[PDB]
Amino acid sequence: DNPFDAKAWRLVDGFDDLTDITYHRHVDDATVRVAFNRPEVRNAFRPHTVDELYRVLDHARMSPDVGVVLLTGNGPSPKDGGWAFCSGGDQRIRGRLHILEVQRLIRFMPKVVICLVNGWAAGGGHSLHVVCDLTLASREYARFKQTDADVGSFDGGYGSAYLARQVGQKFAREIFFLGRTYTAEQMHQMGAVNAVAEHAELETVGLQWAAEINAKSPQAQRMLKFAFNLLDDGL
Amino acid sequence: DNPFDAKAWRLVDGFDDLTDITYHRHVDDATVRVAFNRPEVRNAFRPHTVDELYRVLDHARMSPDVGVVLLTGNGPSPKDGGWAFCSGGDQRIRGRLHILEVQRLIRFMPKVVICLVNGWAAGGGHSLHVVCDLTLASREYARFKQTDADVGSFDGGYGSAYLARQVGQKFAREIFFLGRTYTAEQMHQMGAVNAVAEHAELETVGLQWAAEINAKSPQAQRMLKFAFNLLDDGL
Amino acid sequence: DNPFDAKAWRLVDGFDDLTDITYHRHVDDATVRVAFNRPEVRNAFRPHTVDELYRVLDHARMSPDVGVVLLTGNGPSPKDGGWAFCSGGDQRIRGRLHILEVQRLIRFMPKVVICLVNGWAAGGGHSLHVVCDLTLASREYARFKQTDADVGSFDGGYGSAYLARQVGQKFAREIFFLGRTYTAEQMHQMGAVNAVAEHAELETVGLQWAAEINAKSPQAQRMLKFAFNLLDDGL
Amino acid sequence: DNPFDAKAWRLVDGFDDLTDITYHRHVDDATVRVAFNRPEVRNAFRPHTVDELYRVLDHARMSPDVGVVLLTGNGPSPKDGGWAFCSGGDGRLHILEVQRLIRFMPKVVICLVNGWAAGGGHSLHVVCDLTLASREYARFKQTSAYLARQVGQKFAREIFFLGRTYTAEQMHQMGAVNAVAEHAELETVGLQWAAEINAKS
Amino acid sequence: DNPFDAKAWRLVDGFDDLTDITYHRHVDDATVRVAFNRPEVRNAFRPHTVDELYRVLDHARMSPDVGVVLLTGNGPSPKDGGWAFCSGGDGRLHILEVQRLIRFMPKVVICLVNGWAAGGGHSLHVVCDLTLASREYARFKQTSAYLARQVGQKFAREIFFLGRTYTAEQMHQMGAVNAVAEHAELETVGLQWAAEINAKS
Amino acid sequence: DNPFDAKAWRLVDGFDDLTDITYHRHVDDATVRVAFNRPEVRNAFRPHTVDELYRVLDHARMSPDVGVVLLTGNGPSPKDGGWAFCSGGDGRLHILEVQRLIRFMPKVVICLVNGWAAGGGHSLHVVCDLTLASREYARFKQTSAYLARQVGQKFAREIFFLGRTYTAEQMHQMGAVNAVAEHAELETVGLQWAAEINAKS
């Protein structure tokens, strides 16, 4: 039932030193798979993780033959069989190396990034999903929770404006102010999740979406992402 | 079946002269209840009502030990058993003291305001719900209707931009241009109502939402409200 | 089962030379019907079509006794019985007279334009629906597809910002990046379609919506459209 | 030295009942003059003033043969000889509804700041399409969003946070005032600007 | 006195079929020159001009070794000796698509306003990243949103509503023109600005 | 000639452990002074500096009796005698979180640019409510959105794309600097501005 179809992927050269992240290129498609690789700790990021994540995504950005990024989490946990996309950072922080660098990179890179939420997406992991261009989520195991325990500042979690421009001001304020946990279906209804997929099919669906994106003119796709980010179609 | 659990509340000191509004503080929680108190006239506001409403909300804003405001309407009408949050102002006006003052106050006060729509929310009452941070609505009796009969000017009802940033441009234009009546469920689907609650449970649910809000860092909550209002996370 | 109730309409004077568009005024209501009239080619527009469409809408804009525009497509195709609102322009263009002129006119004219999507709305036809104030869609036959094959430039289809302000950033990016086909119900759920109607009743419903709009103060309606376009209620 | 040229203006039919505002139509031009008429209290508006102002602006907005509205204040003060456009607040309409009408109406509204523009009076000037200001007597004082869209965020925050008084020239340099005119010529220039607008119409 | 230095530019391979636009690559620099080439009609664009302009701008956008686009107009007019950047409209592409490409492309586009910039020509200048303008001959005339984001709402409304003609210096003071240059040196300065951009690249 | 008047300031209780930042409360006024204290490295911030800066700004934000924050840099450099506000980046907090706090806090933050403001140091100045700058020594260099909301898009793109160095006067004319002050008087003026703000409070 694992979403990851290993035989469909190959390691990207030049990243032999990765420990916290996996980075693969599809055997056929102009699509890469970037994944948190710490299932034993629910794919939480430490500063080292963020550094790897940034370098990997930056490489994907600069790779001429890569059109689409699939961003996900490896699993399950060997300990409890649990599934996580990313549980966020240090949940006791108040008592690249910073996730804001990665969120900025995802937002502005001229390529489409699809988040495949295979499990828990909490704290910094939640905001990571939010900033991706598209999100596909595991019907069975995706869980969405906006929390700021991994935020060093006292002024709230990140990406509130992005979320509000997806689900509207009322839902976005609810998600941030209460920090409740939501299912894939609930988030889909609110407008933060594009589609819900069967868990075992999550990456298969992700690959299909990527193929449809890659089949179109790359110039149109990058210009559209720019326009969407600008909130102005330039016309 | 009344949403109001009297024994759970106490009058806030210093408002003995209130006639059109009730103002209570929870016996335990950092939560206040502010309610229209004219059920016999469907909780319509007259200029005096607006003055009281403003002073009460302003006091809540300045109260260090108040985190959350629940804004609602008392009921039912003794005359027809009807339920109203607020039916708006003078529906023949064209043939704080002004509701825009209150809407501004709600929007900008650094505390979360939850509208509990227990019945009709029409005209100025509709826009009042719209400007609140969150809205919970009575499944059985909430009714939403955007109308401008209580507006002195000829240039439309208030808060169109706020609504559009909740339900999107198409739905917001429909709500304003046609002025149809909608149920709690319909408004929830469109994105202007956070959750639908059983009528008798409306304030119980409201208190639960307030508690979850109050359990978090107050600094994060006020900074987030500011960011949401700004349409910019400041990052 | 045809949505068009001919006896309810009369030709607007001064347009005897129209070939690609029909232009009628209701026998009783301050409502006009503007329709693509090339069902045999799925209501695709050629430059001549755009010129006619512009002149007709511009006339509607300047007509003191016209409140509301219903924009639709005539059908069905005699060839395959298919239904189209508008299939867009020249799908091999890359190997007012321009549709952007019409989209601008619709967006800014101080009257409410309701798109009645009676069938395929693709390419430029899709963006035409998007820019209308309201959209009602045929349950059975409406189909929505954002594609740019009829776009002369390499930088993407039009109206991305408008769509994002209706369905949110996630759904809008999906609609543009993948260019999938959606039903009336799907688009209604996402927030780009106001209501779904039975095919045979589409114009009947359209006329009802127009009547409700026309029953209100015209000054309020035009001032509200301006505010909605501005993203600012001016208060 | 008074900006108002009586010979150039005629009262608008049906407004003889106005007490706080004056409303004239130019003898020849497609231009109207709408002015605060409480110079004895620095042209502060009471609720009645707001209602009259809305009524008049709405009528101008509805006038097919009018292209430009000159919004100003009458003076000087019979109390202390001071000059005021509008000193702000001193009731069916809210002043914000007046601002909304000014901003959204399909006419050009030119604010002629003939003196103090303070508080709500300052806000009124800001929302007008264009502003012309008396070199000698215009005084601007905010006692924010829209202002920032004219002078930039740094200057707008300065104006709001320090609450200093600024001259016509100072506001012109910052970008909130289109042009500075000699006091006596303020309405003459306003009419000239209106004439150019109506010619391009 | 002509801004164009023939010795500094080479034609771009594959564009010998251009009739309304010229397209050069600098002899040494990562900079191209794209110019309206209808000086006989004040560099107004017909539908064919728009198509050529899009084609050329797209090619520049696709050029890995080019960092800066100088957008200008050739002159003077062989008809009346006047100078024009672009006088606006005189057909598969819309001019708005040209504006979108100018705004979104990962190259810096510097408009060199060498004369009249009117109507659609004015809009084209506005959407460019930077504008340098001929002191002697630049003339700006709008015959709004984006302009307001450069000069503020008051000035933008003035430019649109009165439709006056403005000089390089006037537009520089308002914030729509980065710098004013002597006519003969306009392209030299443009190249110098481009050089600084490419050095920071 | 040093802007800092030791007699006017007192250390804030509980911050004796600061190494990269200084934090003073004015002897009489509801004003604090927060300053980069790495003049030996042009007041560049390391991760530790960001953490200290956030801690201090948060404390100021929490201070009921403080209305204004003066944000500046100590100098001159004991290494080369240069003057720096902040030269940018040289770790639980991100500098963006510092910018968010500066922008959102219910206090007025006045940046006193006493020297180089480059890279992240330039961005810090931009997000402050107000900026006062040393005539002699302020130097602005971006090595964009928010800046454009102060100087307009054309000038903001110039600042970003060419990466030139600008003086206090130049940035004042463009709208990113509220006022220029003599170096020795920079903090005196800052205190005077703060005094006006606190008086209007």
Side-chain angles (χ1 to χ4, degrees), chain D residues 2-6 8-9 11-15 17-41 43-78 80-140 143 145-148 150-184 186-199 201:
Chain D
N2 200 294
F4 178 68
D5 179 12
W9 301 99
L11 291 174
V12 173
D13 287 337
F15 292 87
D17 55 344
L18 291 178
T19 65
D20 291 17
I21 299 289
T22 63
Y23 187 24
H24 295 88
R25 168 69 178 276
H26 190 268
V27 294
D28 300 314
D29 301 351
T31 306
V32 296
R33 187 189 186 272
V34 175
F36 288 99
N37 202 31
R38 314 186 72 213
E40 71 275 13
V41 287
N43 282 325
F45 52 80
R46 54 183 175 174
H48 179 71
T49 314
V50 180
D51 289 4
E52 278 188 350
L53 183 54
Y54 185 86
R55 173 191 170 197
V56 168
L57 287 172
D58 172 63
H59 178 277
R61 171 262 296 278
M62 285 303 223
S63 301
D65 57 339
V66 171
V68 178
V69 173
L70 306 177
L71 176 66
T72 193
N74 296 330
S77 168
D80 59 28
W83 282 102
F85 161 57
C86 176
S87 61
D90 197 358
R92 295 172 308 101
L93 282 290
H94 195 275
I95 191 70
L96 291 174
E97 287 172 298
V98 168
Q99 296 189 354
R100 177 172 65 170
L101 176 56
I102 287 172
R103 272 220 279 162
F104 294 175
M105 79 166 66
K107 313 289 185 188
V108 180
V109 185
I110 307 176
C111 188
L112 306 179
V113 178
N114 58 290
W116 279 95
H122 185 263
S123 303
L124 270 173
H125 125 73
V126 171
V127 301
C128 289
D129 292 294
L130 304 172
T131 295
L132 302 173
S134 167
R135 183 183 54 81
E136 302 99 303
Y137 296 116
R139 295 289 187 268
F140 299 82
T143 51
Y146 205 71
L147 178 60
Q150 297 166 13
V151 304
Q153 299 218 289
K154 293 274 183 189
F155 286 140
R157 289 175 189 273
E158 173 187 323
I159 293 159
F160 272 75
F161 286 136
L162 281 77
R164 288 176 173 185
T165 301
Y166 299 86
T167 67
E169 180 62 25
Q170 289 172 327
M171 278 296 176
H172 172 60
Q173 292 303 326
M174 282 187 282
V177 162
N178 292 91
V180 184
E182 298 302 291
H183 190 71
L186 181 59
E187 299 187 19
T188 299
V189 176
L191 282 163
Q192 289 167 165
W193 279 50
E196 295 182 34
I197 296 165
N198 285 321
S201 183

Side-chain angles (χ1 to χ4, degrees), chain C residues 93 98 100-101 151-158, chain E residues 54 58 61 91-94 96-97 100-101 104:
Chain C
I93 190 178
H98 197 284
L100 283 170
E101 300 283 349
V151 171
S153 60
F154 297 121
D155 314 303
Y158 315 135
Chain E
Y54 185 86
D58 172 63
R61 171 262 296 278
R92 295 172 308 101
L93 282 290
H94 195 275
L96 291 174
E97 287 172 298
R100 177 172 65 170
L101 176 56
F104 294 175

